[PDB]
């Protein structure tokens, strides 16, 4: 109905807190997830005090109407939160307790430089806008922050849910505003990626490499090109389930390296056949004997260099 | 309007009950399903008691307003249920009968270790938050729990729909709460998986193995690599449905084993030709005759071991 | 506001009726469809009786409020109907005319035993719940039941829209309810399925069979395995439409039979080559000549048997 | 709030017009499209006549309430339109000018008999239902019918947007109703289909036909079967971009003809090889040189006949 | 409740301004993106003037009701925005400050002529309609226009967000209207496309070209046709994320040129084999040596010409 009047000069302080109940539906393409949690607020209003002896009660219960409630919004949400008030209580001195359960979809950027073995941080921002007659600042109540024991994401490990206790005050549209930052840290479960993606590609690459122990041109052509087609199919299967990155990643580097190796293998087979046709079998034998050892060693060294470069 | 007054300390007891009508839309990747059921509540309110003889009626009907109604909320739902009140009736002694019809989307984790032949248990949780003046507890009315005989699920068999009688009481956010558990047990129908998945893969594998009765190198290479491409296509088709799992599953183990077998077959085909060209035409014959019997027996033993480990 | 009082015990009778306008969005996977139609109701309420001479009018129009309207609900709908009242009229003797337009999604199971050439029946259930003081029973008004001439379902032929006159009365949750069934019968348009799906598969199978007129092992292997790879794509394309089927269907039987035929053809080619290697060409020639006639005749007989079984 | 008093028992005529603002989301699979436009109405009400000299004002302005406006609805919409009245004005005479802005999703069947080069007409129906005390008929005002210049559809050209002046009066549900038809004619932009679909298929077919200039049986088998596989792979994307509405069409006939040509080419290659084996090379050469000219001529004649038949 | 009365003839002026908070979900196929921003308005209303000295304050606060608010609406939005008022203030002179946070889905065409290396401009249009007694015009307040520092579009770079000062006044439905234009200029991040799309295609094309150093017909046929299949798969992958293009585009021209090159390569291989069969090795060798250099040079020149033509 009206913000509480300042006594002399003090701004109004609202102590916040979020208690997670569920987090689900993490989307890699759209970089969104859905949340479901409690919201708690507490401020000071001297106009709601009462005498317990005359009233005969301890805490009074109000309704959302006929009481002043500060406006709290989330910055990074696609739509306004769907909320319903649970309870409002008033202490004899004037402190008010407010509890509310909501559900919303949050927007948060994701980093995919280390996609198979990466870790992310999800942000939720709370902001309040000062009224004409009063300045409002936010705070953190550590006794109201937590997560449910059964909170789970599909394929992720939840590590912690904390909040930065220092709000950021700045001027926006002729008014002062205060913001809070809630951080959720998670890690990816990478076990299922190994036998599903990594080892089959190695097997296909080795099958392609087995052409260095043969002199039949047609068989080598069949081997290498068919394995290339299989690699293309697997590449689509992999790079169908992640968004368009702006910078270089790890998976892209590995896939490009594999394409390079296939091209070089084709060149080697062509060179061997062309030298054999010109009745120079010794050079062809030397070249294929060298390639047999050259390919795996270079592959291992390049993979080691990339692994150090991205995870070092 | 206001919670009913206690006598000395007796907590308020609310009797619950859910009668399923339609359950459908079970999503494996989203791990959700949609429900449609009745909800029945009953409690005692001495303020509404009346003498039937004076009023001349046995049951009085009230609108949802002007009557205190406990707040019952589901825990694991994406959004608050959309419900409408059907009937409210008041007994002469003050007992109130309540009935509403709702629909909601339920979040429930799933287990995919024994994926083709698994059984699941879907959970539905009720909870009520105690008010400041009065303490509220939940209960189960065993005569108002059931389901329609017309309930159908696409690919599942309904086994039972029960409720755990004893609630769980805990203090959350400085208030006491009570929680109930409703469990729906289902089992998968697995007959259609056999001729659609299992037998075509076995036929493709046998077609691949037929290369041990041939001596031409190009034909063997063609057979093995083309069957590998077919296997890759089938693997993608199968993985279209099953979501990511943080542990080993039966299907993943089988698929990885098949990839390993293809790799070993390619190695054997290469070895035979290399020995043949090296002017040793007897060791090649020995190796081929050995592999003819070695491959099927080892495949059978490995399948038996896997079926023992995962289903025992 | 309050149901009309009975004379002695005679239950209130409500005459129903549905007039279809649009039917669209029939989803096979979800087994749903979307409807848009009218809804006519008519009952008796003697408290609304008036005489025409003193009133000066023949019919009185009422707003939806200030009058008792029974609660009519559909059973198999994802959400309650989105309806808005159109007209309300009152006869001099007490009869009331009701009319409204709605739109909802109807859940209906489907049968895919004869999927290319099947017929389906769709059910819409109407139910009313008795109030504490009066019992309500539904009836059917045949003059207000029908469908529009412009109703269009993509790929389906609408045949009839009728209702079973006798309702089914049962006791649910300590109250009596009456249920009515409206049945929509449709047939599938199968002609487009012939040149899109059926004939190309026969052509590919014949191309595969053409390998019985050649003795080149590599050419036969190429033909048979490449045609198998071609068949797999068609199998995926066909299977990606229908939902999972608990029982055995026509299409699944045909596809499994085709897989078996490909396997037997591979076996025959391998046997021919192995016999030809051992310098016994007479047996190979006899086997090839026998298979040339054996394969098409057995295929035709198996198809005739399957067609007789699944359609008789 | 009542219908205007009847004058000489004459039906009440209203003038209507629609001015398009946005047209978007033309989903051919569901045969729907969303609209966004204005709506103008006008009729006569003697009760609203006011003296301009005494009032001192030119025209009046009324809230939607305390005045009667006829109920106008769209027949082919999924749900009721979302309308918000903009202006209500009444001239010094009895005429009243009405305006509102709405948005809705419209149902309209589409025909794909000439898919690449087809044209469509989209219908929007307006209906008014007579009341128990008056008859209402519709009319079209030419100056209020129009279309915004910025209205765009992805891949379509907009031709015209007119209305049929003549209504359609009929008795439905024992009431008289009038219908107006607003037609929006569009045509598809078909140039991008040539270099994306038409020419690659011709190139692949010619690559297949190149097998009439060689005698190597293995090479011919490889060419023909691999090009068939490529044709299937291309048909995958062709169906990916093609509307998912099964019916008879031009593209389906073209694809079926291509499959038939591939089958005949395989038959010819097999015949040539079989004749060459039996030491009758003259017949094989005659058949080959005849087919070299026979195939393109028959293909061109079949294309001409189909094009004349479907588009003439 | 009533527009402000003019002094003599001055039209009402409303100063506008939009401050972006979040823009996201840029869809190429649907040509849509979602926005979330502030909206600021300011006009003169002398009916609300007061005296600060006698009132004892400096700024009054009002609800959205009991005050006249101009009806500002967007044009190219799928539905009406979801809006909630944040603040309303009144200056003693009469200037009203209005603030509101909204969210909407915007329609805007895109140009795909230079798709890998293109830039786009996104338009937002505001419009107001003059009332029967007053004329309203729009204006731009540059101090209230800006974008948030955390605004991000996945795969795009944001350049600027400005607006045109001059509105476009025109008459629609016999009422004057004023329209503004806010422009958001963005650029595409093209680096990721290089190693994911461009280089693999070059490698596949070179593998195809390697057939000019061999003289085995079967090997050349296998190489060329298998690389063609790989190109078709890559074409499907590229065209997954792209809408229909009314005019010729860069990528379409490149893909068509690649198809043409494959066809010419097949022609060359067939010609070489046919010449070699007729015992004319000299012409075959000359043609092969000529093509070895002819193909890369022509490909490079055609690429340069296309790049100059489209990016001129
Ligand atoms: C080759 C033939 C044998 C193949 C066996 C199948 C592959 C087994 C991979 C096991 C990975 C593992 O230990 O778990 C991954 C696990 C992740 O833990 P979460 O449960 O996701 O937390 O990672 C680890 O910490 C273990 C590190 C494993 C390294 C790789 C092992 C060697 C694999 C190739 C042989
Ligand atoms: C644009 C440029 C790329 C154009 C397409 C290139 C496809 C790959 C070509 C393969 C080359 C094979 C030629 C070959 O075998 O030559 C052997 C040739 C014969 O020489 P003499 O013994 O005197 O006879 O000797 C060699 O081995 C020379 C080295 C050739 C292989 C290394 C060069 C590869 C260049 C690829 C560039 C791609 C970027
Ligand atoms: C990582 C590297 C991946 C490399 C992929 C190709 C693997 C090798 C393919 C098979 C090569 C066979 C060579 C061969 O036959 O040599 C003959 C060779 C030696 O006999 P002599 O000539 O008297 O000496 O005999 C044999 O083949 C005996 C068996 C040895 C090879 C079999 C085991 C290889 C297993 C590789 C697993 C890699 C993971
Ligand atoms: C080879 C030459 C034949 C190629 C075309 C075979 C299919 C033609 C079917 C046309 C008749 C369909 C028809 O009349 O449908 C209506 C009617 C409706 O049945 P109810 O009344 O519900 O009993 O359908 C039938 O009678 C069903 C008849 C089933 C047997 C014929 C269809 C066989 C189709 C598969 C043939 C083999 C395909 C192999 C590759 C796939
Ligand atoms: C598990 C079982 C499947 C494992 C993989 C199966 C590979 C396919 C079988 C290949 C059989 C080839 C037989 C061959 O080449 O020799 C023919 C052989 C040699 O003749 P003789 O010298 O007189 O002795 O004689 C024959 O014709 C026997 C025919 C046996 C094969 C036919 C039955 C196939 C059985 C498949 C099992 C699954 C069903
Ligand atoms: C060799 C030729 C290669 C280019 C073929 C297309 C060039 C002609 C395009 C012009 C079409 C045109 O005029 O369209 C408008 C006009 C509209 O007429 P209505 O108003 O309905 O009377 O359309 C027509 O008249 C169309 C007439 C038939 C066009 C046939 C075009 C070629 C069709 C494909 C032939 C080859 C098929 C190859 C395989 C395709 C696999 C999908
Ligand atoms: C049941 C229907 C499907 C049956 C299986 C079809 C497989 C493909 C058939 C291929 C036949 C090729 C045989 C061949 O070349 O024989 C040549 C043969 C040998 O001549 P003579 O020395 O007199 O003996 O003569 C010919 O050229 C036969 C001419 C007919 C071949 C064309 C028609 C093939 C059948 C089409 C069926 C379509 C359905
Ligand atoms: C080896 C050959 C080169 C391989 C790398 C290809 C990319 C080279 C260009 C990278 C830099 C792009 C750049 O400057 O973009 C900005 C700039 C934007 O200009 P506006 O502001 O519109 O004026 O873009 C340009 O100027 C583009 C100039 C033409 C670039 C041509 C790049 C090569 C094209 C592909 C050739 C081979 C095609 C192979 C198959 C591709 C299948 C999709
Ligand atoms: C409809 C048109 C499409 C028809 C299908 C395309 C078939 C593919 C053409 C293959 C031609 C191969 C024939 C060949 O090499 O002949 C060589 C032939 C033999 O000459 P002599 O020794 O005197 O006898 O001489 C030549 O080189 C002829 C010229 C061949 C190159 C030009 C062909 C181009 C055809 C383009 C048609 C499609 C557009
Ligand atoms: Cl919010
Ligand atoms: Cl809830
Ligand atoms: Cl309903
Ligand atoms: Cl409507
Ligand atoms: Cl708007």
Author numbering:
A (entry chain C), B (entry chain D), C (entry chain E), D (entry chain A), E (entry chain B): 5 to 316
Can I see the authors' text?
To explore this, we prepared a nanodisc-embedded GLIC-Y251A mutant at pH 2.5 for cryo-EM analysis. Particles corresponding to i1o4 state were reconstructed to a map with nominal resolution of 2.87 Å, with clear densities across all regions. Therefore, the functional profile of GLIC-Y251A i1o4 should resemble the GLIC-WT i1o4 which is partially conductive. The pronounced reduction of the o5 state in Y251A, even at pH 2.5, compared to WT at pH 4.0, indicates a drastic shift in activation equilibrium. This suggests that Y251 is essential for stabilizing the outward conformation of the M2–M3 loop in coordination with the outward displacement of F116. Our cryo-EM data yielded unexpected results with 86.5% nonconductive channels, 11.3% partially conductive channels and only 2.2% conductive channels, which suggests that the Y251A mutation reduces the channel conductivity significantly. These findings suggest that Y251 plays a crucial role in gating by stabilizing the outward M2–M3 loop conformation (o).
Gloeobacter violaceus proton-gated ion channel (GLIC), a prokaryotic model of pLGICs, is particularly well-suited to stabilize preactive states under suboptimal activating conditions modulated by pH. The GLIC homomer consists of five subunits, each with an ECD and TMD. GLIC is activated by the protonation of a series of titratable residues in the ECD, leading to counterclockwise rotation and contraction of the ECD.
